[PDB]
Amino acid sequence: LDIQMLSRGLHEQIFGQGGEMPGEAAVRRSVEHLQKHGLWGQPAVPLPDVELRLPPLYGDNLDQHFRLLAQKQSLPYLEAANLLLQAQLPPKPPAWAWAEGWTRYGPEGEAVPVAIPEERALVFDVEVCLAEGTCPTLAVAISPSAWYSWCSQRLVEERYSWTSQLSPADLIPLEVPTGADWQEQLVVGHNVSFDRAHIREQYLIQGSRMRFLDTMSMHMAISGLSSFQRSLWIAAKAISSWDWLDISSVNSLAEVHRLYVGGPPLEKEPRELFVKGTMKDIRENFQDLMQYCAQDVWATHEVFQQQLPLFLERCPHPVTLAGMLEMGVSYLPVNQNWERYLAEAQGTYEELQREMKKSLMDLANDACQLLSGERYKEDPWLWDLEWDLQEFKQDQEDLGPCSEEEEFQQDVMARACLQKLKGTTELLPKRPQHLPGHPGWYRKLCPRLDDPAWTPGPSLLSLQMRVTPKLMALTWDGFPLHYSERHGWGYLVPGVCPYRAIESLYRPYNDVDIPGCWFFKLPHKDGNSCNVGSPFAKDFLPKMEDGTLQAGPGGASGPRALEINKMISFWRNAHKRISSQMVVWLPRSALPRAVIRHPDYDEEGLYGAILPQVVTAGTITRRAVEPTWLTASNARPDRVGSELKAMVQAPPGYTLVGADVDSQELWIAAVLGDAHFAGMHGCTAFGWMTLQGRKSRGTDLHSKTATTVGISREHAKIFNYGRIYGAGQPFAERLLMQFNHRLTQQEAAEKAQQMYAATKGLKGGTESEMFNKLESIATSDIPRTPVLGCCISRALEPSAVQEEFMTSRVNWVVQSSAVDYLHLMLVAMKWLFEEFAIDGRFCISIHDEVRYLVREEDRYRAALALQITNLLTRCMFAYKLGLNDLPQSVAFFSAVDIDRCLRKEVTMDCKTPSNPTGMERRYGIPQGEALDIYQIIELTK
Amino acid sequence: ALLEICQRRHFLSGSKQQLSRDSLLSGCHPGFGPLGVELRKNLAAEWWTSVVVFREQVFPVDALHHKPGGKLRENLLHGALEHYVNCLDLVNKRLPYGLAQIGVCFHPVFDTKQIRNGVKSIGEKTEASLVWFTPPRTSNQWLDFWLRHRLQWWRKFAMSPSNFSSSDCQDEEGRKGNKLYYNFPWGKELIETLWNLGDHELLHMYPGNVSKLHGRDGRKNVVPCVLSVNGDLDRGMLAYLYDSFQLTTRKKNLHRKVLKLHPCLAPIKVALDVGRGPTLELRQVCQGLFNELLENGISVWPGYLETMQSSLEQLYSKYDEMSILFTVLVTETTLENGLIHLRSRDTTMKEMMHISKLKDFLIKYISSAKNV
Amino acid sequence: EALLEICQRRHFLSGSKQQLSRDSLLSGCHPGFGPLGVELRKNLAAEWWTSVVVFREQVFPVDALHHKPGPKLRENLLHGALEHYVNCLDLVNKRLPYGLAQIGVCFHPVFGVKSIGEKTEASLVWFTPPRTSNQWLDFWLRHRLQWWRKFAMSPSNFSSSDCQDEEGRKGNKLYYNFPWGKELIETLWNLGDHELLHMYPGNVSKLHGRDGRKNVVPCVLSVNGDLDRGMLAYLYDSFQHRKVLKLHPCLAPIKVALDVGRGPTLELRQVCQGLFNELLENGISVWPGYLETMQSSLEQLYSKYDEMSILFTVLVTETTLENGLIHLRSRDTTMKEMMHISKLKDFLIKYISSAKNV
DNA sequence: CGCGCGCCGCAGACTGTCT
DNA sequence: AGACAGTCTGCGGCGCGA
């Protein structure tokens, strides 16, 4: 109805916040702050007015409406947890049942077979045999009433499929037979996501309304270890501060139980039959393994009992608990194209590495000569190798065609006489000697003959070895790379030899020219450039595109090796995790009627889900941690296997509706500093860069910097991203490293002269310093995060370390705030999907991003809901602190991606194999501000 | 140039000095030598293993060299098209299948200028043709799959796989296809073509009814599109032989002059020989080893019938130019301790190894060379 | 008779039932052979190569073009072989006793009044000293007769006879006794300097080879066998109430047949694929009889696999998911045996080796 | 930068041999 | 009973991602 801007683009209309606290009349401070060093003048480009009828609010006020939503979400689960918290726990049974299905043990150890554990609350654990690792092997559970065990068909010996449909254990009963909690169940466990991966009903597309709690998540939120803190904790089994050792523990169950419960130490199996054992040995040692698993389950139950009140008091707001429950429900659907993608990626990796392997084995074989004439001694590359040799240690006319050739067998048995020589002699060397005749350096590169995975030639020869550079590699004029203590110079961060060969290859004592030919056998080499940390593998790729770096055979061999290494590095690192992902393929009966009735439903095709097995709070900032899914490469053409995200494809009749928060960390820091400075949203200069900032003009955060080299795309952005977080002086010298690498004292003087985003003694920040709020939060010891409250850790709290690991503490604020944002988004999305019939409650777990598996017929509606959350969430960040209003620029997501697969942008093809049309995946056509025409009620349009 | 004289010294390219780039590429060469024949047989066997044997639905078919009115054949595709209907019964109408064949095809060669060849000067080329009947919906998927598979096969057994390349192309009718080339020293030469005919030939040769040509790709029955994958092996042999040789490098100082062919398609694997010692009691051992290796299936150069011995070092060069993986020497010391020498292709280092279990060593060397 | 109908139905001979006939099969004027016939031809050619070329170290492969380059499709591989005799002389170090072998297609006129019939033939030309020419002729005749009788179920049908043409001094010819009568399947000829120095006129100083010094003139022995007639003879030998068609284990186109009985789950297809890969990695050809529509019948399946001359029928049932036992049915003894999965590959390899040895 | 998760090459210290 | 092969096992070095 009105612009309602107040000199900045502010969110149009106010529906839930109400009208009060109009202005503090302290605008002059922000005015002459923005006047200083320019930046006051602004176009102030308007945005289209948005008029939306929000759903009714039960709370009647923000920060109470969300409290009511979280309470209504987590009431049954908190009730179940409280029921589990009471102590009515019987002792462990004397002997386990050893029977298929679920078996319950009440008093005196009597075992009764039961179809399903009829318990509202459970503490669950599954132990899995590494052989055929997809199947769950065995599992146990404990409730306040009785114990439960599950074996997974170990009495009968058979051959089983790799699909793993019915393999996972059943844990949910039918909705028609539920306790009067009621239809709500909570499962507690250490690394509970691993156990959730083995639950039969957790793979259905429809919602399961069962939630999970992770003991590692609660421990990490309460008391976790970050980076050196963890390693030092292992080192002691930090300077002038080690109190945190007594309140900190690693994420392992044993140390967690030692820290919290403090009972007798838990002991692990030296046999580790589940990890390094076969199935038969597990069958024989069934009782001991089940006893150990039950002991671990008891330990996790005790830890949960000791954790729940501490977690609740350190995280009072129910929104955090509800978001934690919701984050452990990620689905990540997939279809038959997942296996095809895995096979294609493996084949491509084998192709690329085989090409490079052959190219290297050729050089190795050609270099295996030069030993006959002792030519390696005069060689300028291979004279350092040992070149050892070890002993074995032991006419007559045509005469006719002849006949009676049947006696040929005589000579055959003559050959057998030499077989007899195996026994009559050879006993002086019974162990098979490995290539005595070849040089020792070539000897090392070949696989042992007894190896089942044996291939001809020096197959154990890849890049980044100490011999491959000597085979061909050469820099400038100087040929040698001794690497005895330090390699051949280079890299980013600093810190008999035939002289006749040195003269021939030309084209204290000191050196007239720093580069050029190497001189003398003294390996000190004057310490030029980085010495010890030079791999000579990757960083030199753009430095190699000139005469400074040249390979032996050809000018394109070295570049080809570097390019192929870059292509296959990611897959070499990640193929074990990616190919080992657990996939459960749903049968036709399990799929809903919508999927089978939908067109383009590929019959004779496999559909399933890959539960990410993600730790909800694996990082001390409560951030979700998963090695593969959360940390995976975006689709790229050069890198092999980068299309991992694109293979998360919704089933027929379903789609992924998600979004991405625009500069979540930067906006959070900006608004926090803005609130710390004044009460308006554009008061801080950094806030004005973040809010209403354009790269076209100087209003952008990175463009206004000095930019000594003069680049805004790369030079000015890495500088800004490094000054925040660490704010290191070596990071300042890295700019001198990049360009203008001269006059180092001048570089230091220039860096000192840069006061922007910097503070002096006259302590606290002055002028454009957002760090003041972060430092104030970092030294409070009360519930620290400004949004809804969350303490950092008893390990990293003040009075445990005085001034140590400060950077981790200050980044925890903006990082923990992002996690709270994610929790708020999840709570709002759950509320919106429950209040209005929007089927497809499932979500996909990503950091700074939330994707939801929805039906096509509500693809746009759900998107609108997301935008509504993106409003109501940011309003929370406004409701806390002094910012009563919210800017219009960040009020909504830039674009809501509706797609059939998971990718950063829907208008993007991976083209890793350069055939993106092999799988049916069209564009997404994201919607931004065009969804407001509809309403969230189903009976619309 | 030098490669050509090497090939002919060791009876690989063929006979007489008439062979050149144009005659070799056009198929007008007088014929391949015994080593050339062995290389062709090995390449055909590898192609058969990669295409026909390892695939359940691909079947062998035979196409007559001439067709009735007849002017011989220029491609093997027509025979596969004629056998489509007959072989549909064999696959019980499982539509996505194929017919593979290897045979000699005839092409006109135009020398031009003097001695106009016209229809004469027929050039013979060994063509391996796979005609793959596919559903229309997934025709492009199978096109890409076959292109990738054939490029892998050609890059397999390749000393420098980067020389092999692929390109896209469109027919005069607009039909998609791909062409694979090998980068010879003079330039890239075509060695294989994949074409997506799109079921035109089926209706052309069977215009009566379509109901008899229907094949099941699932619940429904459709008229298959045709994917013709036609590669030539003579140019394949030329490509592999040129790739095995060196260029035409800096501070090389190595002049071994060796044809580093792949172990799987090398013409001769191991060469037997006799060391310095008493005649007889060594010829019998060599004969027994020869019989063992032939019963295994490893081709062996006898080598122990020659009596020059070429000072023991020139014959190593002869075998290297002959593309022989191993040189087995049986000396008088074999009767005392059953140990023989192994020079081996590449890494010209003497290997002492017991005569026993050489069966296992050679079989494993041949089998494990295919994989990496 | 029923032989032609059975081979047509089971894709041994390609074409129509009425078009194949009998006389068109003896000549090359027939549509061709089915995939089973092609595989049988490949096996026969490979075994001929093993018995003739590799075993005899002197015999070398030769490459002869299908057409004469100047003045025509070739009618025999002998003339094609003789062009490279001089070049292959250097390879053998001019030692006179040595051979040149090739398997290739040859075209003949058949009295569209005149038709062109193409048949694949295996030809070896053996250059020897003239004095030992007759001894080598007898040696080759004996070895060829042994080779043809090795795979015969009734070796008495393979016989030999003496022709003694007016051109060559001595010669032999091998016959197979088809039901209608004897048919020539291989010819043996001894030729002197005739049509050897003709192709190389002038001084014979370049064409002669050394044998006990003295550089004696060569004498050629041409041995030419018809492989298509060979398969015809072997297929007629296999046949004999049941339509069994007992082909030799080394010559049968398909060794074993993979199939499924009760189809409880899809895992049967997985284990069948695994067994397929394992068998094919070792060189054993197996017909993928599984993945067939709903398992129409079992006894009819056995009859079909017999008519295709499959050595063994492998049936995978539900019990195979408990132990490795599968049903193995023998073509000859029509006996069924429970047999573990892991022992199938080695068992088949040893069976093939034992059949080859005897 | 500040962290989260992975891998792969190379020098030393046990057995574990063997003649 | 006095020299040299396998395993771990601890070091340094990658790569990759919000």
PDB file of N, CA and C in Angstrom, chain A residues 94-141:
ATOM      1  N   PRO A  94      20.370 -63.206  30.498  1.00  0.00           N
ATOM      2  CA  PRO A  94      21.543 -64.088  30.597  1.00  0.00           C
ATOM      3  C   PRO A  94      21.975 -64.652  29.257  1.00  0.00           C
ATOM      4  N   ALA A  95      21.027 -65.084  28.426  1.00  0.00           N
ATOM      5  CA  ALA A  95      21.319 -65.674  27.126  1.00  0.00           C
ATOM      6  C   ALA A  95      20.377 -65.092  26.085  1.00  0.00           C
ATOM      7  N   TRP A  96      20.931 -64.710  24.937  1.00  0.00           N
ATOM      8  CA  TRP A  96      20.137 -64.162  23.852  1.00  0.00           C
ATOM      9  C   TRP A  96      19.397 -65.276  23.113  1.00  0.00           C
ATOM     10  N   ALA A  97      18.368 -64.879  22.363  1.00  0.00           N
ATOM     11  CA  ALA A  97      17.441 -65.848  21.788  1.00  0.00           C
ATOM     12  C   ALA A  97      18.044 -66.602  20.608  1.00  0.00           C
ATOM     13  N   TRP A  98      18.778 -65.913  19.738  1.00  0.00           N
ATOM     14  CA  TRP A  98      19.256 -66.488  18.480  1.00  0.00           C
ATOM     15  C   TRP A  98      18.076 -66.985  17.641  1.00  0.00           C
ATOM     16  N   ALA A  99      17.239 -66.024  17.255  1.00  0.00           N
ATOM     17  CA  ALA A  99      16.061 -66.304  16.451  1.00  0.00           C
ATOM     18  C   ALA A  99      15.826 -65.149  15.491  1.00  0.00           C
ATOM     19  N   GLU A 100      15.141 -65.444  14.390  1.00  0.00           N
ATOM     20  CA  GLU A 100      14.847 -64.426  13.393  1.00  0.00           C
ATOM     21  C   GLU A 100      13.754 -63.480  13.885  1.00  0.00           C
ATOM     22  N   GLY A 101      13.739 -62.279  13.319  1.00  0.00           N
ATOM     23  CA  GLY A 101      12.757 -61.290  13.706  1.00  0.00           C
ATOM     24  C   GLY A 101      13.111 -60.625  15.024  1.00  0.00           C
ATOM     25  N   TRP A 102      12.110 -59.975  15.608  1.00  0.00           N
ATOM     26  CA  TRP A 102      12.264 -59.265  16.869  1.00  0.00           C
ATOM     27  C   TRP A 102      11.877 -60.172  18.028  1.00  0.00           C
ATOM     28  N   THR A 103      12.727 -60.202  19.051  1.00  0.00           N
ATOM     29  CA  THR A 103      12.474 -60.976  20.256  1.00  0.00           C
ATOM     30  C   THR A 103      12.634 -60.082  21.475  1.00  0.00           C
ATOM     31  N   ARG A 104      11.694 -60.203  22.411  1.00  0.00           N
ATOM     32  CA  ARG A 104      11.652 -59.374  23.604  1.00  0.00           C
ATOM     33  C   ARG A 104      12.017 -60.194  24.834  1.00  0.00           C
ATOM     34  N   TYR A 105      12.807 -59.577  25.711  1.00  0.00           N
ATOM     35  CA  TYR A 105      13.218 -60.159  26.986  1.00  0.00           C
ATOM     36  C   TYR A 105      12.697 -59.284  28.116  1.00  0.00           C
ATOM     37  N   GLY A 106      11.752 -59.824  28.881  1.00  0.00           N
ATOM     38  CA  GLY A 106      11.250 -59.184  30.072  1.00  0.00           C
ATOM     39  C   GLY A 106      11.995 -59.675  31.302  1.00  0.00           C
ATOM     40  N   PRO A 107      11.292 -59.914  32.411  1.00  0.00           N
ATOM     41  CA  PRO A 107      11.978 -60.431  33.600  1.00  0.00           C
ATOM     42  C   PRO A 107      12.525 -61.828  33.356  1.00  0.00           C
ATOM     43  N   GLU A 108      13.529 -62.188  34.160  1.00  0.00           N
ATOM     44  CA  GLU A 108      14.181 -63.505  34.196  1.00  0.00           C
ATOM     45  C   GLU A 108      14.626 -63.989  32.815  1.00  0.00           C
ATOM     46  N   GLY A 109      14.773 -63.084  31.849  1.00  0.00           N
ATOM     47  CA  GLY A 109      15.381 -63.421  30.579  1.00  0.00           C
ATOM     48  C   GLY A 109      14.548 -64.264  29.641  1.00  0.00           C
ATOM     49  N   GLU A 110      13.263 -64.457  29.918  1.00  0.00           N
ATOM     50  CA  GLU A 110      12.428 -65.218  28.998  1.00  0.00           C
ATOM     51  C   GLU A 110      12.280 -64.462  27.684  1.00  0.00           C
ATOM     52  N   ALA A 111      12.512 -65.164  26.578  1.00  0.00           N
ATOM     53  CA  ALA A 111      12.482 -64.571  25.248  1.00  0.00           C
ATOM     54  C   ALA A 111      11.165 -64.912  24.566  1.00  0.00           C
ATOM     55  N   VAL A 112      10.461 -63.885  24.102  1.00  0.00           N
ATOM     56  CA  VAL A 112       9.177 -64.032  23.429  1.00  0.00           C
ATOM     57  C   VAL A 112       9.312 -63.424  22.040  1.00  0.00           C
ATOM     58  N   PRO A 113       8.969 -64.136  20.962  1.00  0.00           N
ATOM     59  CA  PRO A 113       8.989 -63.493  19.639  1.00  0.00           C
ATOM     60  C   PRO A 113       7.839 -62.506  19.501  1.00  0.00           C
ATOM     61  N   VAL A 114       8.156 -61.302  19.026  1.00  0.00           N
ATOM     62  CA  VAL A 114       7.164 -60.262  18.796  1.00  0.00           C
ATOM     63  C   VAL A 114       7.380 -59.690  17.405  1.00  0.00           C
ATOM     64  N   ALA A 115       6.271 -59.414  16.716  1.00  0.00           N
ATOM     65  CA  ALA A 115       6.359 -58.904  15.352  1.00  0.00           C
ATOM     66  C   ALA A 115       7.070 -57.558  15.308  1.00  0.00           C
ATOM     67  N   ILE A 116       6.765 -56.673  16.251  1.00  0.00           N
ATOM     68  CA  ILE A 116       7.337 -55.330  16.264  1.00  0.00           C
ATOM     69  C   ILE A 116       7.477 -54.906  17.723  1.00  0.00           C
ATOM     70  N   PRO A 117       8.516 -54.148  18.111  1.00  0.00           N
ATOM     71  CA  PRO A 117       8.542 -53.619  19.482  1.00  0.00           C
ATOM     72  C   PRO A 117       7.496 -52.537  19.695  1.00  0.00           C
ATOM     73  N   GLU A 118       6.475 -52.832  20.499  1.00  0.00           N
ATOM     74  CA  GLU A 118       5.401 -51.876  20.771  1.00  0.00           C
ATOM     75  C   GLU A 118       5.850 -50.920  21.877  1.00  0.00           C
ATOM     76  N   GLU A 119       6.790 -50.050  21.514  1.00  0.00           N
ATOM     77  CA  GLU A 119       7.375 -49.089  22.437  1.00  0.00           C
ATOM     78  C   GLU A 119       7.401 -47.710  21.796  1.00  0.00           C
ATOM     79  N   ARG A 120       6.983 -46.702  22.562  1.00  0.00           N
ATOM     80  CA  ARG A 120       7.021 -45.329  22.076  1.00  0.00           C
ATOM     81  C   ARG A 120       8.440 -44.783  22.029  1.00  0.00           C
ATOM     82  N   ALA A 121       9.281 -45.164  22.985  1.00  0.00           N
ATOM     83  CA  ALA A 121      10.663 -44.715  23.055  1.00  0.00           C
ATOM     84  C   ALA A 121      11.587 -45.923  23.049  1.00  0.00           C
ATOM     85  N   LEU A 122      12.694 -45.805  22.322  1.00  0.00           N
ATOM     86  CA  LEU A 122      13.669 -46.876  22.209  1.00  0.00           C
ATOM     87  C   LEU A 122      15.065 -46.279  22.158  1.00  0.00           C
ATOM     88  N   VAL A 123      16.040 -47.045  22.638  1.00  0.00           N
ATOM     89  CA  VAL A 123      17.447 -46.797  22.352  1.00  0.00           C
ATOM     90  C   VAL A 123      17.936 -47.969  21.520  1.00  0.00           C
ATOM     91  N   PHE A 124      18.421 -47.673  20.318  1.00  0.00           N
ATOM     92  CA  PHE A 124      18.636 -48.659  19.271  1.00  0.00           C
ATOM     93  C   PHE A 124      20.102 -48.694  18.868  1.00  0.00           C
ATOM     94  N   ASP A 125      20.560 -49.870  18.447  1.00  0.00           N
ATOM     95  CA  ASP A 125      21.883 -49.992  17.858  1.00  0.00           C
ATOM     96  C   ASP A 125      21.885 -51.166  16.894  1.00  0.00           C
ATOM     97  N   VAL A 126      22.622 -51.012  15.798  1.00  0.00           N
ATOM     98  CA  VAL A 126      22.792 -52.056  14.798  1.00  0.00           C
ATOM     99  C   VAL A 126      24.282 -52.279  14.594  1.00  0.00           C
ATOM    100  N   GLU A 127      24.688 -53.544  14.596  1.00  0.00           N
ATOM    101  CA  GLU A 127      26.042 -53.946  14.252  1.00  0.00           C
ATOM    102  C   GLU A 127      25.981 -54.680  12.923  1.00  0.00           C
ATOM    103  N   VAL A 128      26.905 -54.334  12.029  1.00  0.00           N
ATOM    104  CA  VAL A 128      26.861 -54.723  10.626  1.00  0.00           C
ATOM    105  C   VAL A 128      28.148 -55.455  10.271  1.00  0.00           C
ATOM    106  N   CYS A 129      28.009 -56.590   9.590  1.00  0.00           N
ATOM    107  CA  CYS A 129      29.174 -57.299   9.078  1.00  0.00           C
ATOM    108  C   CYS A 129      29.688 -56.605   7.824  1.00  0.00           C
ATOM    109  N   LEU A 130      30.998 -56.355   7.777  1.00  0.00           N
ATOM    110  CA  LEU A 130      31.561 -55.629   6.641  1.00  0.00           C
ATOM    111  C   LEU A 130      31.369 -56.402   5.343  1.00  0.00           C
ATOM    112  N   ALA A 131      31.561 -57.718   5.375  1.00  0.00           N
ATOM    113  CA  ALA A 131      31.198 -58.543   4.233  1.00  0.00           C
ATOM    114  C   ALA A 131      29.711 -58.387   3.950  1.00  0.00           C
ATOM    115  N   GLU A 132      29.374 -58.227   2.673  1.00  0.00           N
ATOM    116  CA  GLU A 132      28.033 -57.843   2.224  1.00  0.00           C
ATOM    117  C   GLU A 132      27.449 -56.773   3.146  1.00  0.00           C
ATOM    118  N   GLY A 133      28.160 -55.647   3.208  1.00  0.00           N
ATOM    119  CA  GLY A 133      27.886 -54.613   4.192  1.00  0.00           C
ATOM    120  C   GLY A 133      26.519 -53.971   4.084  1.00  0.00           C
ATOM    121  N   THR A 134      25.818 -54.152   2.966  1.00  0.00           N
ATOM    122  CA  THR A 134      24.506 -53.533   2.828  1.00  0.00           C
ATOM    123  C   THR A 134      23.507 -54.096   3.832  1.00  0.00           C
ATOM    124  N   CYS A 135      23.541 -55.401   4.081  1.00  0.00           N
ATOM    125  CA  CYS A 135      22.610 -55.988   5.030  1.00  0.00           C
ATOM    126  C   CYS A 135      22.948 -55.521   6.447  1.00  0.00           C
ATOM    127  N   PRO A 136      21.957 -55.443   7.346  1.00  0.00           N
ATOM    128  CA  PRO A 136      22.234 -54.888   8.683  1.00  0.00           C
ATOM    129  C   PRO A 136      22.969 -55.827   9.626  1.00  0.00           C
ATOM    130  N   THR A 137      23.014 -57.128   9.342  1.00  0.00           N
ATOM    131  CA  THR A 137      23.502 -58.140  10.288  1.00  0.00           C
ATOM    132  C   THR A 137      22.611 -58.070  11.525  1.00  0.00           C
ATOM    133  N   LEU A 138      23.125 -57.776  12.721  1.00  0.00           N
ATOM    134  CA  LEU A 138      22.326 -57.894  13.937  1.00  0.00           C
ATOM    135  C   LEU A 138      22.060 -56.526  14.552  1.00  0.00           C
ATOM    136  N   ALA A 139      21.140 -56.497  15.516  1.00  0.00           N
ATOM    137  CA  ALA A 139      20.778 -55.246  16.166  1.00  0.00           C
ATOM    138  C   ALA A 139      20.086 -55.535  17.491  1.00  0.00           C
ATOM    139  N   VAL A 140      20.137 -54.561  18.401  1.00  0.00           N
ATOM    140  CA  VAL A 140      19.427 -54.641  19.669  1.00  0.00           C
ATOM    141  C   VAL A 140      18.788 -53.293  19.979  1.00  0.00           C
ATOM    142  N   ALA A 141      17.818 -53.333  20.890  1.00  0.00           N
ATOM    143  CA  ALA A 141      17.106 -52.145  21.329  1.00  0.00           C
ATOM    144  C   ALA A 141      16.723 -52.325  22.789  1.00  0.00           C
TER     145      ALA A 141
END
